[PDB]
Each structure stands twice: as C-alpha cells, then as structure tokens.
Symmetry: D2
Subunit: 385 residues, 4 copies
C-alpha cells in the first residue's frame, strides 16, 4: 500500500508543521522550515502541499523578505516536483480578527480582511493553485446580541461577491471553496454545515464560481453523517475540494489522522469518492498529536495515505463481489435508481395499482435485507472475505 503522486495526496504546511500549542499547553515541537516539509512530504509519496498566506510569509513581512520566502519555496517545488493545488487566507490568528474577518462588526477590519485575501489570491495563482479555500473560523458569536445574523450574511455575501468580481476581472482560472465548521473557536460559527454553505452559495451573484470544502471531523462535530453530506455536495455539483481527517464524535476538533475516529464512515466515504469519480486532491487537514516527536509526525502523515489506500482496496472488493451485487438487488438498490413516475403525473393519478388496488400489507411484509448487506460490507472491510 504505497502512495504515488498519481494518488493526488496533499497536506497543509500547518499540519505536519503544527508545534503542539493547544488551549492548555505550550508547544512540544520546534517549527518546521516549509522547505523541509516539502522535501519530507515528497519522500513519503505526497502529490503536493497547501498553505495559508501566514504559513509561507510570516505576518508583517516586508516586500523583500516576502520575495525571499516565495523563491525559497518555489525552488523546493521545482527540486521535488511537488504541486500547490490549493491555498487559503489566515483570517483567524491575529488579534485584529477576534470578531471575524468578512463579518467583523468593525467596517475597517472587514475591508482589511478583503485586501489581505486578494493579495494571497494573486500569489496562489502564481504558484498554480486551482482552488482557493475560505474557512470563516472567527465569523460567529458567543452571545446572541453580539451579531445580527441577517446583517452578517449580507456582509458575507458582499465579501464573496467582490472576490468573484476580482478573479473574473483579472481573468484568473481559480474557483472558491467554502469550508464549514459548526463551532470552535467561536461559540457558534456562521454557515455551520455543508448544507448551510450550499444554501448560501445559491444567493451569490456568480454561484458557478463557488463550491464547498467539507472536512470529515467538522460535520461529525454536529453528529452528522459525513458520507451523506458529501453525497449531497456531489449531487449539487459542488464538491470542489475535501479535507480528510479523523474525529471521535461530538467534542473539540481533534484533527486525528485519516482512518482514525469513525472507521466505518471513512470506509463509506472512500467508497463514495471512488465510485463517483471525484478527481480533486485528497487533502489531509490533520494534526500529529503533541505527544509525538518529529519521527511520529512523519509516521502519522504516512498513516493518512496508507489508510486511504487500504480502504480503497476494501471498497473496490466490496462492489466487485457478485455476492454483494446480488445482495444489492435483494435490497432493491436497483429500484431506487429507477424513476418513480416517468409515466408522468396524469398517468400516476389514474394508476389504480398505485392506490385503490395497492396491497399495502403485501408491500409492508417485504424485508429490506439491509442487515445481511451490511454484514457483507463489514466482512469486506475486515478482510474476512
């Protein structure tokens, strides 16, 4: 189970670079030179890396230092062949963003947030990024009076609309992906789930420029079924990017390596991604636990990719099994894919077999055979067939 760049595995600089600074504790690891991360990730078989503006260029850098950091970074890309498919803006670390970026109550902060974003979009295009992610981590509230949510959604739409005006006026080939999260670091965050972000996008001036970047652990922090949410995003045509990691239920955002947390949900996610032909990056937004030293960092990152590849093989074996294919017919998955009333409304109204002569007791007595199917899926996952 060895990854190749063909597998399109990508990592954020801030992931393997996380120093272990948590709400109750100081850092446990020194900082990583972004050049060193690129080289170690290329050795592990990764396809590319992603970045926040502030990961690459330390905040408040002069134009000249800015240029040094980019040229060093670009040289590591050329030496390794690594790509940069995605980039994003840090609108959450600096104290100025304590009430948000695009939806801060203070107008001058909102204008500053836009300028900081536009500057990094230029840089992301230069480095070849296809997707630009927006995580509004500080957009939200701890108390109800602090934020009028209708006004804040007006400001949020205004920000995204101007960003789309900029990329089209510049003739850039880049698309935006909104990343939802229900809470943390704010008490409640705006657009808290995949569904709220999809709904919001349909009100933008240019909906076709925006999609979602869902993260495994984020939807699970609301107790939701992550493969169900990904299916709705694919159904809407909006799965532009995806963040893979692990999460053990409803609690703080753990960012465990992918495959940890809910293992069966990971199995059904890979099954969905592979059968639907998702072709974007398989990005890992995770944190090697602060118990680890640098050898444990690279072991954890390696494990993300290995676990995806094992699950890919198990899901492919599950769908190819003739015994599973007959189980799928036994549970009538084939009939789910068939139109309910392609004969049309009027034919439906006149069809006595649909109501007057429908035998409800006969239909009700039919078992769905879902438990035998699910045990076949379990046996496959576990390699017990």
């Amino acid at each position: 189970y060895q990854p190749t760049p063909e597998d399109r595995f990508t990592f954020g600089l801030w992931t393997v670079g996380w120093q272990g600074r948590d709400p109750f504790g100081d850092a446990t690891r020194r900082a990583l030179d972004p050049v060193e991360s690129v080289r170690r990730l290329a050795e592990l078989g990764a396809h590319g890396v992603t970045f926040h503006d502030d990961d690459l260029i330390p905040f408040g850098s002069s134009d000249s230092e800015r240029e040094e950091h980019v040229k060093r970074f670009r040289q590591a890309l050329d030496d390794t062949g690594m790509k940069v498919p995605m980039a994003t803006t840090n609108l959450f670390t600096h104290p100025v963003f304590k009430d948000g970026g695009f939806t801060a109550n203070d107008r001058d902060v909102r204008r500053y947030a836009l300028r900081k974003t536009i500057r990094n979009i230029d840089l992301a295009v230069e480095l070849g990024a296809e997707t630009y992610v927006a995580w509004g981590g500080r957009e939200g509230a701890e108390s109800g009076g602090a934020k009028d949510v209708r006004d804040a959604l007006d400001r949020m739409k205004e920000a995204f609309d101007l960003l789309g005006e900029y990329v089209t006026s510049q003739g850039y080939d880049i698309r935006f992906a909104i990343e939802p999260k229900p809470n943390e670091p704010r008490g409640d965050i705006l657009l808290p789930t995949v569904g709220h972000a999809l709904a919001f996008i349909e009100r933008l001036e240019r909906p076709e420029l925006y999609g979602v970047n869902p993260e495994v652990g984020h939807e699970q922090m609301a107790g939701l079924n992550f493969p169900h949410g990904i299916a709705q995003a694919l159904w809407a045509g909006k799965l532009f990017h995806i963040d893979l990691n692990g999460q053990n239920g409803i609690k703080y955002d753990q960012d465990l390596r992918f495959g940890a947390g809910d293992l069966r949900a990971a199995f059904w996610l890979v099954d969905l991604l592979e059968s639907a032909g998702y072709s974007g990056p398989r990005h890992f937004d995770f944190k090697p636990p602060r118990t680890e030293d640098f050898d444990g960092v690279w072991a954890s990152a390696a494990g993300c990719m290995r676990n995806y590849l094992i699950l890919k093989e198990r899901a492919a074996a599950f769908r190819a099994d003739p015994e599973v294919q007959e189980a799928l017919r036994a549970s009538r998955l084939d009939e789910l894919a068939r139109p309910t009333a392609a004969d049309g409304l009027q034919a439906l109204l006149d069809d006595r077999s649909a109501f007057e002569e429908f035998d409800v007791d006969a239909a009700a007595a039919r078992g769905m055979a879902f438990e035998r199917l699910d045990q076949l899926a379990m046996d496959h996952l576990l390699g017990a067939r």
Copy 2:
C-alpha cells in the same frame, strides 16, 4: 399574559392528543376525539389546529366514514371559529413506510406515498390550509450500503417536483414547507438540517413554491444554534412556517413545551421572530409528558403560549431600552449593517487606509463590549431591569 386568536397560536392534533406511547412503554392516556381537542384549544385562546391525514381520518377508512369525520371536524371549526393553517401527510407510521415514503427503495411504495399525499392536499385546500408540510421521518438509513444518497435525492426531487406540478395544474394557492430533522426514527435522516433543506430547494423545478418548517428541538439535536438557522432562513426568504417546542441538548427528540429546554435560545428566537415581522402561525409541535393526565395536558399547552408571550414582552423591553441601544452602538452593531465596500472593488484596491496604512494594532486593541451587552439582555430576560 393571556393569549388571543390574534397571536396566531396553533397546535397539532397529535400534540395534545399524544397518548404517551414511547419506545419503552404503553399509552398512559386515552385517545382524544379531534372535536374535543378543537373545543379545549379554542377555550385556551388558540388560533387554530393542524393535522396529519391519519390524525383526522383513521387509516383505511371508507369514503363514507371519511366524509363523516370531515363533517364532524368542520362543524367544530364553525362552532369555535378555529382555523386550519397547515396540514401534512403521515408517511411514517404504517409499516409499509419502514424504508421511507418518497425515497423508499421499492418503487411501488414511492408511487403509493405520492398518491396518499395528493389526496390530503385536496382536503387541506378544502379546509383552508395555507401551508402543506413534509417531514420525511423515514427517509434515511441505519447502514451505509442500504441507500445511495444521490439516487435518493433524485427520487426526493422527483416527488416534490410532481407535487408542485399538481398544485399548479389545479390552481391551488398553497405552498410547501420541508421540515428537517437529523435523526430518529432513522439512524440518519436525509436533509438533516435547515441548511440542507434550503440547499435542496434551489434544485427544484419551481423553487418559489417551497420553503422550510424548522423545529426548535430538531436543530438542537445536532447542537446547532436555532436562532442562527432561523435567521438564515429569513435571509433566504424561506421561513414559511415554524415549529416551537423545547429540547435539552443532543439526545432523543423530547418535544417539551415551548420555553422549556434552552431558555435563552427561546428568548433570542422570539426577539428575532418579532423584530423581523414573521407573520405566519406560531405552531407548537410538542408532547405533554406521559406522566401527565388530561389536566396536565391542558396546563402544558397553556404554558407554551404563556412562555411565548412573556418572552415577547422581555425582548421588546430589551430593544426599547435606550441603555441597550447605546450598548448596541458601543459594540458596533450599527457598523455591521453598513456595506463593507459600497465604493466598489477598484476603490477598495486603491484605498491605502484599508491595508498599507491600516493600523492593525489599534484596531485589535478595541474591545467589542459584548459581555456588558449580554448582561443587559440577561437582566431584561430575568426582569431585573
């Protein structure tokens, strides 16, 4: 704090009529004649009632018994002046719906679900219903292989599209409201939150015919902020109906009387509903606990309305307080309502005060004063000012 029909308080027949049958226990109350509920609710000051088809007409009734039940019901409406603003279909109780109604794997069940719905839409229009609610309680899955969610969303869209074809071909003035719920009775339910339903509606043939019917306890079963979700629905123009009740966090659907559960969320909900001028029914979907006899049923129903009216007075006092209005300015709620860049993109790019000469340290040091505002809201809620 006495309700009048002017307050537009409505109750489902299945609410005060719930016999106490729960997963682990038999009924504790006899059944209520729907005529008797209408009269007792009219005495308490309610504006109207709602119904499932199977609440009013017991399942499998002949055409003749059907007509008797409707005429008895209509007579109670005329005697009391009570209205019927909303109606809905039971697609969850009969065993035939064990894998869903509109998204059952079996095609013939899906056709039967549509015919059962269309029959009740005719009856709801006859009784003057403005809104027709759809709660897909059985649309979902306990296991991942059992339901292809993309296919099921195709079937769900097909069902709602045909329903909209029917109402427009009949020239009916009625609109649909989808009611989301994350889980129970299925392990995960499709369209699990307000956001997922709003997103789904934008893919229907005739989006303008569909809105949402959110329920307090349902969004709280996912840990979400219910007033935030209602604000997004109002922002989208889709709050057609609302279900009020109480819920104590993430657990089974409690359906406590309104005001129980999360009291401060109820305060902020009423504040939002009243300041935005929501003018639809204030519907209570609740269950008097099975510890209660019939006197406790009517006490619980009375309490729903009383608690709304107390919170309405407290929220109105909060917004009218000049001290609160200056606190709102101190926290810059006025600046949130102001466009970020009405001067436009190009003016923003050239505005040096927005980036090159923005003093981030000065902006960052400004306190938001959110805690003083929130304590003013607490004092108001508690009547301690």
Copy 3:
C-alpha cells in the same frame, strides 16, 4: 468464525423478539413464541438466553397460566441445552411505572415495584440465573422540581438494600448488576453512567452483592469511552455482566448489532475483555432494525457473534506480534505498570533526581511514539498484517 456454546454468547428474548414498534411507527413483525426463539438461537450456536419477567409471563397472568409458560420454556431449555445466566424485571412498560419503580414519588408504587421484583428473583434462581440485572429506565425526571435527587437516592438505596436482605435471608447464590443509562425514556435518568453506579454501590449495606452491567451504546450516548469505563469497572472488581451492541454517537439508543457503530471501540473492548480474562456471558442487547423480516432478524443476531469472533482474532494477533511488543516498550507501557514510588514517601522527598536535578527539557523532548503503535493496531484490525 463459527460460534460454539463455549463462547458464552447470550441473547435477550426481547432482542430477536422485538416487533419493530418505535416512537413513530407500528410493529413490522409478528410476535415470537419464546420457545421458538430458544430453538433458533440454539441453532445459531448461542449459549443461552435472558428474560424480563414480562417477556416470559404476560403481565397479569394467573398462577396457572404462569406455570404453563414456565414449563413450556423449561422444556425448550432441556431440549436444546440452552442456559439462563441472567434475568431482570420490567419496571418500565406498564403505565403504573410512568414516574419510576424504586423511586416513584407514590409510595404504594414503590412497594409494588419491590414485590414484582422479588417474585421474579425466585423464578430466576429456579431457572439457574447467576446474575439479576436492574435497569432503572423510568427513574428520573423531565423537569427539575419533579424529583428531589437526594430523596430519590435514599429510596433507591432502600430498595437495593431490601433486595439484598431478601437474597441473603433465602440463601440464594445470585448477585445484582445495575445497568446505567444517561437518558431515554426519561429526560435524565438517575445513575446515568458506569461511574455513577459504581459510586452508588459503595453506599449500600452489602456492597459485595452488587456490580454493574454496562452497555456499549449507553455510555456512548454520553460521548464516553466505553473501553475506559469497562477498565474502571474491572479495576474495581465490579464487572459482573456486560451488554454488547452498537451505537453511532450521541443520539437516541440505537441498539445496533455488535460491531456496528464505533468499530475501533469494539476492537479495543474485545482486546480488554480477553486480556483481562472476563469469564461471564457475552450478552447482546440489540434490536434487529424494523426494516427486516425474520430472516434478517437471524442474520443480524448471527452477525453479533461473528463480529465478536473476528475482533477476538485480530486483537489476539495484535498482542502476539513481536513488532507490537517492541512498539509497546518504545511507548513505555512497561513503565506505566511499574510503581511510581515503591521506595516510599520519604525516599521520594529526598530523591534529588526527582526534582532538583530532574532535566525537564530532556524528558519533554522524548516522543511517545503513540502514532506508530496506533497504526500497527489499525493494520491488525484491517488484516493488513
């Protein structure tokens, strides 16, 4: 992976016998004759069955019908060789228990609950039960004023103390096991977790007669780590019985088949049960989903046992792997098992290497190597080594 009675797999009559009646729906399966369940479970390789008094003897049966039901049941045991290791009382279904059994506010109900329990203890001893389980499903509250919890704990202690007086005065060799649950069907239930029950037992007159019967899904309804809780119960010497099933996070009590829900928690549970030498029944308290017919019932029950046996093999392979054993030493699990200060308090105070000359920076820089260990456990679970 075929079960034998040697594996000590047991099932409740109410499990495979559940008709599918849930809060929102009627039954989907006919009732099962307890004789028929015993025979079908013996065919699947189960070791035995358990019962509530009301599962075996329908409520309100005359003495004569009572005797018929027992003799029929006993004959099925003798024909099959099946055992009855555990029994329990239904103090939750009849409306009389709507405010609880042992802690009902009405004194006469509490006395009735005790008499109903004592009658079934006699029957359980006759049938050879070793353990008598108490699940206080109705002991709790929906509102805060309804129950003084100190008084209710007094009543709860009084009930359990009298039950222990009865078994010792009768010279019975049977022990009690309290089954915790955080909520449902009450809004909050008393003794909501394994920890609260262990604490409560230490206040009984005869603590040695009482232990816990924890259930997988119940502790997970509070977001807790079920293997951690089982370890604390083993540590205290109180794991008398255990209920195995599956649960997908914090929501209504799903009672999925064992191995469904949180798969990695099931792996770590079996690892703990097997390495600690738990020798009691492996009882399954689960519900075949109501989507299923009777063939799906037996497939689901079969799956409970299969999944335990697959996980037993994987956990045994994990602990026997020399590479894992060196990984365990690398993470210092061996040092965790060693006393911190067997040299004693005074030696500790004088040990300069423990404080004055302790190199905190050297200790802090040591990686725990926990991620490599956990990936070895994942590879083992998945059969990828």
Copy 4:
C-alpha cells in the same frame, strides 16, 4: 444585587487573567499582575482568589524570586482582606506533561509531578488554603493502545495515596478535591465525570480526605444533568468545592460566565446549593471572551456574581410560595421523602395491599401534575409571579 464577601465568591487568578490565547489565535490582552487582580476583585466585592503554582510563581523561578512573588501577593491579601480558600497544581502546561502527570507512562515524570505538587501544598497551607484541587487534564489518551487504564488507575491511586500520607504526616488541615472532565485537552480523560471520581475515591487508603470539585461546563460536555450530579455528590457527603461557569451543550469547554449557557440548570443548581446549605466557596472558573478588553473582563466577572444573586432570590421565592408548596404536595414530593418500607422486609412480603390487592389501574391513572409545577418554577425564574 450587590455582592459582599459574606457571599463567599471566589475567582481563579487564571480566569480574569486569561490573555485570550486559544487553539487558533494569539493573545488579545496583556498579562495581569496578580496583585492587580486581587485589588480589582476586592473592589467588585469578591471574597477571595485561588491559584495554580505556576500562576503565582513563574515556572523555573529561583528560591529568591519565589519569595518575592509570595511576599508581594501576601501584601495584597493583607491590604484587601481577600482570602485564599483553594489552591492547585499546574500539571498540564509544560511540555514535560504531554502524556500526563500522575499517570504519564514515563516513571520519572510521575515522580516529578508528585514533587511539584507537594511543594505547592506547603505554600497553600501557608496562605491558609482549606482545599487543594487536582485536575488531571493530561491524564488520558488519544488512542487505545497508548494507555492501559487499569495500570493508569493503579498509578493514579498511588499518587493520591502518597499525597494523603504527606498531609497527615505533616499534620496539615487541608482536604483534596478531584475535578472531573470528560475530554479536552486529551481525547478522553480519566475519571471523566463526577460519578467516576466518587467511585475512584472509595478505593483510596483514606477516603475521608478526598471529595470532588465538579464544574458546570464539564458535566455538560457529556450531556449530563449538572444539578443531578451535584445532588449525588452531596448525598455521598463529598461536595468539597464547586466551579461555577456556563456552557452551551456538547462542544469544546467554553468557560462562559456563570448564568450564561443553560440558564434553567443554573436556577436548579442554586436552588439545590442553597436548600442543602452548601457552605464552601462559590468559585468561578470562567474565561472572559477574547473579544473583550479589560473593561469587559471586569464586567464579565461582575456578571458571574450578579447572576448567582438573582437566581438565589428567584429560587428562594419559588420555595417560599404557598402555591408552590401545595403544588409540591400535589406531585407527591412529600411521599418521595417517606421510607418505602420502614415496616421492613417481612411486613412488605405479607402486605397484600402491596401486590395481590394493589389496584395498578387506579395508581396508573393518577397524573403526576409535573407540568403545572414546572410552569410555576418558570414563572418564578422570569419574575412573572
């Protein structure tokens, strides 16, 4: 509603002193001199302050600087009259504690944790602390193989037993209080709830020296009823100290000011504390949100005390209302307080009115009248009577 030192309100130095450093953001406030906090808290009417060793004496201070910091602190106590009722050890911030303090896998860290604790116990006694709190924030695991929980409980017992040997050998009049928390910063923390800590204490050599320090938000992070848990702790005689704050359901540990979060739970908590005559400190472990400047810090701290005092008045008015007292009799709270069978086991067995002649249908038809009682409590809380 003005606090006096008589009200016994206390604050941690780390509370009003929190700089706003969260997992995703830098500090938003400068550090507070502990002398300045003591003076500002004395002005607000607080009774006293608490501290971690590392709050008062910066880590790694020489003996001489140590003495300066204590003398400065003591002078502020003498100038203000403020007390120090409680103290605790920081065994979570320094990287050396990344796998725990008392249960770290590395033996030498465990010995260091004990020495660091013993040093601060000496200082707490000098300053007059009555209670010494232990929060094992790093005792736990992110993965299942990393910690054998039985071994870790052995080490945990060994640590607490040696601490009790030290205080008794020194003739100190101080008691220990264990503070539970379910998770964060570890994935699961040992002794995760009030119940698990009470159970654990009964296995210590000297149980009478140990009690619990429960925190509002911590039990709510597991979805538990905090007033129920406090009642069990009072029932066991182990409520030595309590931490008051606010929490909005199951998510990261918010540490909102007291009265925020679940308002009705706060009402029932104060009702319980006041009616049971809890006489220890009313300690606030909270965090002024990082949106706030220093004026907002003191407003938030003031609000903690105000909200306790408003709720104290409302709960006292509720219990003194004759209409409530008759409602309590109507719901049979008086009968809950009465022994179930003071006549004894044999009298119970022979009492035909308890079983043979018990009218279950008559008892079952009695309403509990719990909803009318709860609405009286709501009206009282809201000042609507």
